[PDB]
């Protein structure tokens, strides 16, 4: 995350490859289910031998004896509908919920986050020289309407996508942050309204970020789970 600061986000998880390395983020939606981005995977039938999800630590590379660290093998991937840019990962085991590891709520089907809503992005991805890129960083964004977004994006943003306000300072989620959550605090709950996806340009001054809009796809998520 560029332009952010060290923080905690107990529903954000780290996806780990065969070499034990962080490659993408994810969002804890059920005790054994992680919602993430399709662009984190080479195919929908990717060989996921050796892949795990790590939870409960602020560090990208924690000491393996770390008390709050949970490490769970990936059981399987399920690709979302065409145009969703989503993947669900089932874990080989159900994680244990505590103060460091918490489920984020799913939105109601078709729900539109109102403009001006404040949301948080989080991840262990690149900071482009704006911070320590080996701890969890967070940034606060502000939702804008798709109509307002599509002025600068010239109509490219789909109904299946949502946007946040372009920031004057370079701020946003880039490489290694894909699949993590856009979490919005509304109606007395943190709710997973978006998933971080690749954009044409990342953390670019005055350019609105675009996320996949989770409320469009919640029928599929519930069905799969």
């Amino acid at each position: 995350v560029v332009g952010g600061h060290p923080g905690n986000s107990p529903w954000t998880v780290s996806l780990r490859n065969r070499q034990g390395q962080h490659f993408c983020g994810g969002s804890l939606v059920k005790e054994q289910w992680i919602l993430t981005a399709r662009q984190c995977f080479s195919s929908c039938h990717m060989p996921l031998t050796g892949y795990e999800v790590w939870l409960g630590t602020l560090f990208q590379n924690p000491q393996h004896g770390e008390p709050s660290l949970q490490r769970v093998p990936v059981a399987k991937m399920v690709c979302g509908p065409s145009g969703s840019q989503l993947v669900l990962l089932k874990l080989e085991r159900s994680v244990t919920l505590n103060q460091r590891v918490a489920l984020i709520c799913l939105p109601p089907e078709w729900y539109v986050v109102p403009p001006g809503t404040k949301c948080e992005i989080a991840g262990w991805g690149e900071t482009k020289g704006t911070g320590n890129d080996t701890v969890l960083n967070v940034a606060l964004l502000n939702v804008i309407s798709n109509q307002e977004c599509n002025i600068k994006h010239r109509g490219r943003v789909r109904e299946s996508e949502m946007c946040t306000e372009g920031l004057l300072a370079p701020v946003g989620a880039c490489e290694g942050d894909y699949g993590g959550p856009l979490a919005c605090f509304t109606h007395n709950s943190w709710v997973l309204e978006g998933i971080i996806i690749p954009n044409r340009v990342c953390a670019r001054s005055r350019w609105p970020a675009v996320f996949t809009r989770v409320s469009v796809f919640v029928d599929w998520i519930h069905k799969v789970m």
Binding site: N8, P10, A102, L103, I104, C105, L106, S189, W190, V191
Partner: peptide
């Protein structure tokens, strides 16, 4: 869900 959704408590921090």
């Amino acid at each position: 869900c959704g408590k921090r």
